[PDB]
Amino acid sequence: GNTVTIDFMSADGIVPGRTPVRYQGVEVGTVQDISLSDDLRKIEVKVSIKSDMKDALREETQFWLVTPKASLAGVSGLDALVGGNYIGMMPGKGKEQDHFVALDTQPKYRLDNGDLMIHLQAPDLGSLNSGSLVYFRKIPVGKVYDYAINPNKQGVVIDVLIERRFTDLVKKGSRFWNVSGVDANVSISGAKVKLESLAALVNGAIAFDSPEESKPAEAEDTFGLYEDLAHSQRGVIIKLELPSGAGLTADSTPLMYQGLEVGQLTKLDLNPGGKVTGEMTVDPSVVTLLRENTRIELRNPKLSLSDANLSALLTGKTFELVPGDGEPRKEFVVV
Amino acid sequence: GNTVTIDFMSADGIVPGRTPVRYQGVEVGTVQDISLSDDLRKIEVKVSIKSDMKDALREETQFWLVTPKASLAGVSGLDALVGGNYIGMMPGKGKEQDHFVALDTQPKYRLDNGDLMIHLQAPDLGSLNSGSLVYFRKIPVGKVYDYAINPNKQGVVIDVLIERRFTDLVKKGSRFWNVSGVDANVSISGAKVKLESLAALVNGAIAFDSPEESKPAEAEDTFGLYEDLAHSQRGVIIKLELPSGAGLTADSTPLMYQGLEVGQLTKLDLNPGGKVTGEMTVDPSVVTLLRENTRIELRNPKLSLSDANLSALLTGKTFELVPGDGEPRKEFVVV
Amino acid sequence: GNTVTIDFMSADGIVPGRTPVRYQGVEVGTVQDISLSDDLRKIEVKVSIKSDMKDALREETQFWLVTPKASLAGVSGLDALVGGNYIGMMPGKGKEQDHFVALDTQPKYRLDNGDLMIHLQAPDLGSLNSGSLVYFRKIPVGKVYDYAINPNKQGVVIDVLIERRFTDLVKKGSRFWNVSGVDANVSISGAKVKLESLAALVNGAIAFDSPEESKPAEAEDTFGLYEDLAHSQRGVIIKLELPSGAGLTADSTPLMYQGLEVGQLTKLDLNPGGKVTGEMTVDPSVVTLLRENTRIELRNPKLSLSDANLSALLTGKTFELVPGDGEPRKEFVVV
Amino acid sequence: GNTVTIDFMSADGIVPGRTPVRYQGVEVGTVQDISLSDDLRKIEVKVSIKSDMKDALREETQFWLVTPKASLAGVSGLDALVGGNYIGMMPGKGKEQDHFVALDTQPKYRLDNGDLMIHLQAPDLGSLNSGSLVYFRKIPVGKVYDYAINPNKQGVVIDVLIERRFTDLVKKGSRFWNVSGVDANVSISGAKVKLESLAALVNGAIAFDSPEESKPAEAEDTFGLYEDLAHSQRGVIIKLELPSGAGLTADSTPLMYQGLEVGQLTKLDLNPGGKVTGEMTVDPSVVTLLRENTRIELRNPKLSLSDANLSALLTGKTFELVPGDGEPRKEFVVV
Amino acid sequence: GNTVTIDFMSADGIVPGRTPVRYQGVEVGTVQDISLSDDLRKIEVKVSIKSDMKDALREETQFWLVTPKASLAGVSGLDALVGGNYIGMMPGKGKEQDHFVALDTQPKYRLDNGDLMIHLQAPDLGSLNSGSLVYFRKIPVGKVYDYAINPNKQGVVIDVLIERRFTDLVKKGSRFWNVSGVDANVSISGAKVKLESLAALVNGAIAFDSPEESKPAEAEDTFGLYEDLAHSQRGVIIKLELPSGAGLTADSTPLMYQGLEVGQLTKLDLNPGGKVTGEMTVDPSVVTLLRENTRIELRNPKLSLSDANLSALLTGKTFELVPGDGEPRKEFVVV
Amino acid sequence: GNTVTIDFMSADGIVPGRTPVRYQGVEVGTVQDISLSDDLRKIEVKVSIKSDMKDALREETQFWLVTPKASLAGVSGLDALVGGNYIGMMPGKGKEQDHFVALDTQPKYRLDNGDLMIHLQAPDLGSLNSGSLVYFRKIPVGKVYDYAINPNKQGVVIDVLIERRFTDLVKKGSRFWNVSGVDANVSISGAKVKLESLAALVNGAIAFDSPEESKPAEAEDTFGLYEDLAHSQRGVIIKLELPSGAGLTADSTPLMYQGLEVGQLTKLDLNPGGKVTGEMTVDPSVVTLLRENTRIELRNPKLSLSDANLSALLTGKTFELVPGDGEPRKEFVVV
């Protein structure tokens, strides 16, 4: 039994009856008192901590309020069924101390038990919450640990925690993508809807791939987070100089070869001077064919009277590949 | 232990067993008695407050009944699972006082702990409730604190509270928009639905942008609240003098250039004299092109027999940009 | 401690353990006994009331059973989670009395604390329950208090209660309309669904407008309740003498002027003699144009080969306005 | 304290702790024991009843097990949240008796407190459960009390209970119809969905009309239960002798007059001899026009090149009325 | 108080505090101990049974673990709200015994209290669970008692239990069909969705018909279980020798007569030799017409220019009946 | 009463009040203490185990933390209603031991009580969780026991547990397929949706077939897991050498014979050299017809003016079978 005062901003969800001090999920302390200091809305919380932790307690010790995760019941309003709050701590070397300032948020992942801590760089957080789940072959092999805006305001850094035995799965050449929320598609000539898993709808998810021959990633290695499985397909970036973007779509325009979809127009820009230029990811089995005097030309959805097909008219503009021979080149001009 | 009488209008959710007086979330008092005074339906509530707050208690002290937020369980009818009521207080200098009049609503945000309090001006409240959430890069960085009708009855003022560390995000040139409720779209040549986040469906949300070079906003700075992300896009307002509004739509009519969508007709009016005039927000990369003898003329969805495209007929009227050279001008005449 | 006997029809939800007598939400009494009298299914309920209310208790005192509101959990069947019943009372001058007859329903709103009590006249109740909510700029400023059939059986009178500070909002020229339930629309050339707020789906809602210059309404002033926001638009009623109602729709037929929608056919009748006559609400900015030799003639959706537009064929018959000069007239003849 | 043995078939939901004997909702008795008699699965339940009811208890006393209503939580499987069972009784003159046989179901409505008990004759029960609700102007004015198959197996008799003050609403010429479940419609030239109320989806409902001048119904008067509001419209049955039923629909074929929908083909039969004959309900304002040499002839959806209307082709076959003069007749021949 | 040991496979949901031994729903025993025997995972459960049942307890006594029904809350994961387990018993003549082997499942229906036990033969279980409900005129008149695979593995036998008073409803010529799950239909010229009842969605249901003149079925009489109400329509099987199955559908091809749908192609096969043969159920009122030189020939959906009907083209191939005279025949040849 | 220390990684859901040690579902032990050892985040848990298990307790004893299954309430956030954790054990011969290391996951299925343990090889886990259900004729005859990635990272091995009496159902030639999640189909000429069972939506399911004459499988026999019932149809693989894949679809292209669907194009590849080759599963009744000079040629959806059928144009390319005579061959060339 001891007395430790922690200064908080808001006394919400802190009850002297049952609010534990869970260090590593272990009930170490118990909140005793909540008093107020009037200046800058200081909240003095008196907490009784056990004996050996008291001799472990030192000046650099981090306390922070922990609230349950953002859930469906929490946005529904069922405050009786979600759970309870606790406060967390991390002892540091420091000096002898009695008065502690609370932390605004969770401290950085310091501990080492073999779990892998890697960083993901997304343009926004998406449907991901802290505690959303990471899949490999739709098997949960980790979780989203934390997220924070980078110093440049452009991005969100989401750092995730792969479990110990699955660390061999993550490679240098792994690609991570986002599987969160529901997308319903209406497709021509019939429609079928199978988007994503049940847990990924409510909370969000991040799935990833493991390539065949790559060195295993380690120790806070960064990764780009793609927004879709189709955005994370491998292939070769091919620059195109388009005449106009009249019927061309950012991600819906295919590259046909022998009637089969080989590539996908992935980017479409209006460069100054009035020059529409785009670029296209092609499948690796076809990258042998891309050479000098290999032409890529766009086909109109022409009206066919002899073979009445609605699919050709519904798709629209369609890039056709005609192969050639010579040195491999990687940028073409469409006329 | 003390006796303080507070006069309320309706004695609902006030039980002498468990109704606390939460000052800054801190259980200070406890309701002791509810008696009625017959004139004007006065309700005398006797409340026992602690000792140091009693010597802090003074004449300008604001008490008000606090009810849980409007939730899905509250509109569902689960009154056993939502929570409980409390009353709130704010001590002021004043004089010695025993008899207090309750307040109809929450008092204005007085305290200063570094959190930013800014005002938003909307034409209506929308799906926003008090306690709905404010996002930056889909990261919750604040909350909607209060809302009130302005003295002119035209508007709703919604004042929100950005947290202390995220105050640097809000700038003078920031734009806020509304992300609340579900919109389902049926698009031509296929349909895909990804509107908004899960928490924003039930309660509502306000997202915002941070520009690159602007002075940081502070101390009750006002902002317009756009209703949509598309309504909050930057660009240049261009006045147009239209012949008629025959196939033109308020927000669905694009400005093509080189086959790419550059601008968007945003407003369409019938001025007296029978003169249809509208205006159009264009993208900044194109604002270099808008000059004298630069024409903006509308194209019909003409029926094409050689290239059978359904997209041209489904879109309809389409503003085409043809650039020219000279002094930049910002209002055009469509014929 | 006293003994008061109240005679009820059905002893449902009345338990001697916990059934309070909430006068103005204040727990005054407690049910002691339930016995039966056999004639006409009389139910004698013995109730112990406090001392000062006992000297306040007099012959004209109204007791009535109060049941929780119709909720989603009540129609779901969760009788454990909804709540509990109580009985209500209203003391009147009267005489000394011990035996009381219960009331079938809630008594009329007698008390005066500044809240406004106005009446709304609807053809049916709609999705409105007692306790549904009244909005101004989507801000809840009152509630539906009671509803009852008028002596003519044609109507429903719904009397609502605007709160004290918002009484200035309600004017003589205010229009109230109904925002309750979900409507999903499929629109041509794409579809978008944003109907109404979340709380209005489950329980129902009434929104209203406040005009600019009108005297403020007071003291049980009646109002018509429109069923839709489009039905509550201001404008001028214009009588039309139609040839036939061949492609004309009750509320879906527009009045074009300069290609813009100005008015809306609102009523379409077959008067005896075989004379189809209708009427049309026009926008006030156009009411200057309606004059002698101003013609209103209907346009067919003619098939256009030069400009292929599906919108013209999908809309159908379309009233066109051609303006003229002279004395203003308000009834026209369509040929 | 007494001992009364009641023989049941299945001892389900009968606990000696809390199972009351609710006579008219009043807790009269309490289950004491459950023992089994082996022959024909007899279940002897010992029940302690109060003193005055014991001297009231006589040989013709009906006991029956009461189970909560069929709810959403009961089909969901939430057996902890629905409620509890009780048994019911009705004392009759009889003789002194100790041993009672339970009843399979609820006894017939015997009591008289002014509530109206009328019978409805439907071809099947529909979505109606016992305890579903009866509406007038969408105001709940009664409930479905019981249902039973008539001695001819063709029908279901549903007997309902209108409350005391609303007995004046029910007339001899009242029509009752069914408002239960959800119907979603896809309409041409746009689609809008507003079917029914929220409580009617889960449990079902019966709405009814009150005519202007009719004698008020009383004392177990029968009524047909229509399945739809459109099936309950008043009008005149008109027999038609059709050539064939080639494009004619059972309820979707209208009778036009002056371009307005006047009547509705309601029945379509193939009489032996190969004679397709149908019948049609017409609106009363038109019944003046139906006379000798008044012809009713069907129009094809002919393809119109000058006025391109999709509505005419989407509707199909359409009965046209051409009026004449002479004696009124009520059966016509279509050629 | 006694000691009875029962050997179970898995000790799940068996708690020594509250697990009763419900014989015929009557709490007879209470679980005292759970110990393990190591060989073949034997679980010795000690149970204290009452005195008279102990003298009733004999060697052929069947004990089996009973788990709550498969519910929505059980698949949702709400294990706190579903309920509790019990074990069941059936005493048999036998000998004196102390050690009992548990049963894997429920024993066969032995008892006779007038309830009817009939068998249904389905190709699969469908959405039916044990405890799903059986309807007549949408009135619940029984329940699904048990289900088991027959010795030939082709089928599922589902044996159901009609209640005592409704035994007269079930006849020899009754047909049972399946009403379980939700089917949503998109119909041409408009769409309307009313499939099935609310309880049948979650758990499943079996409805049935009662013919007019048939001997009442009894004592484990078998019945085929049709999968749909349309599959259970009466009529005459008519064999057809088709040219090809080019536009013919298994259940969507109608037999027209006088423009009315009379029959339905119900089966379509490719017999060896390359001979497409099918068969068709026709309505009984038409079976008088089927004779020698009565032809059944298929009509193409020919394009009609004079009468523009989309319904003819949307339906497709259509069997037409042309009647003749002579001896009745029941197999035809389509050319 | 004893003392056993178990070292865990994270002390979550381990409370000294109620956390049992369920060996084979039997409450053997109870958690006494949670202390921390600082190095590598060791968590010492003291557990009191019963006497006979203590003399059974030996060095190879496996302890592991067990968490409830992934449920809808667990992803919803209802942590109060899901359940509680326990730890599991398996005694092994070993030596005397006091200090135990916890296991990361469930140990392999060691015990033998007649239940069948077979392995399934899928490319990903799908919607299957541990504890999802296995169906035969939609009858639950087992469950998914465990899942783990194979040493090659390509696959997921899911090992399932068929119950004792249903072991005869599983054969060598059985095929298992996946019935998990909801698929909604929009079909031409009308749409109907009946995908899968209610329990399979939330948690997932695996159904399987039992062939007629096969030896019964046993003792960890592997099986491929098909993703669909259509992917698991028997038939003969037929290699095709296609000209191009212009209108051909991976699984939507049928093989017609006599107007009936016989086979299905199942695979479509672009082999290097620019050679599109595919393969097709045909029905066994037709495999007699596949011979030398039997041609398989693709038909265009040609526009038919005499017989206006939308189905032919909506389907598209269609493989036609024309049979011949000679030796049976299994690979064809399409021109």
Coordinates of N, CA and C in Angstrom, one line a residue, chain C residues 255-257 289 293-297 299 320-324:
Chain C
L255 N -42.8 22.4 -64.5 CA -43.0 23.6 -65.3 C -41.6 24.2 -65.7
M256 N -41.2 24.0 -67.0 CA -40.0 24.5 -67.4 C -40.1 26.0 -67.8
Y257 N -39.0 26.7 -67.5 CA -38.8 28.0 -68.1 C -37.3 28.2 -68.3
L289 N -44.0 37.0 -63.9 CA -44.2 36.8 -65.3 C -45.6 36.3 -65.7
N293 N -52.1 37.0 -71.7 CA -51.4 36.4 -72.8 C -50.0 35.8 -72.4
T294 N -49.9 35.1 -71.3 CA -48.8 34.2 -70.9 C -49.4 32.8 -71.0
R295 N -48.8 32.0 -71.9 CA -49.3 30.7 -72.2 C -48.4 29.6 -71.4
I296 N -49.1 28.6 -71.0 CA -48.5 27.4 -70.4 C -48.9 26.2 -71.2
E297 N -48.0 25.7 -72.0 CA -48.3 24.6 -72.9 C -47.4 23.4 -72.7
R299 N -45.2 20.0 -73.5 CA -44.4 19.5 -74.5 C -44.3 18.0 -74.4
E320 N -44.3 23.8 -70.4 CA -43.4 24.9 -70.8 C -44.1 26.2 -70.5
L321 N -43.4 27.2 -70.0 CA -43.9 28.5 -69.7 C -43.4 29.5 -70.8
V322 N -44.3 30.2 -71.5 CA -44.0 31.3 -72.4 C -44.6 32.6 -71.9
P323 N -43.8 33.5 -71.4 CA -44.4 34.7 -70.7 C -45.0 35.7 -71.6
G324 N -45.9 36.5 -71.1 CA -46.5 37.6 -71.8 C -46.7 38.8 -70.9

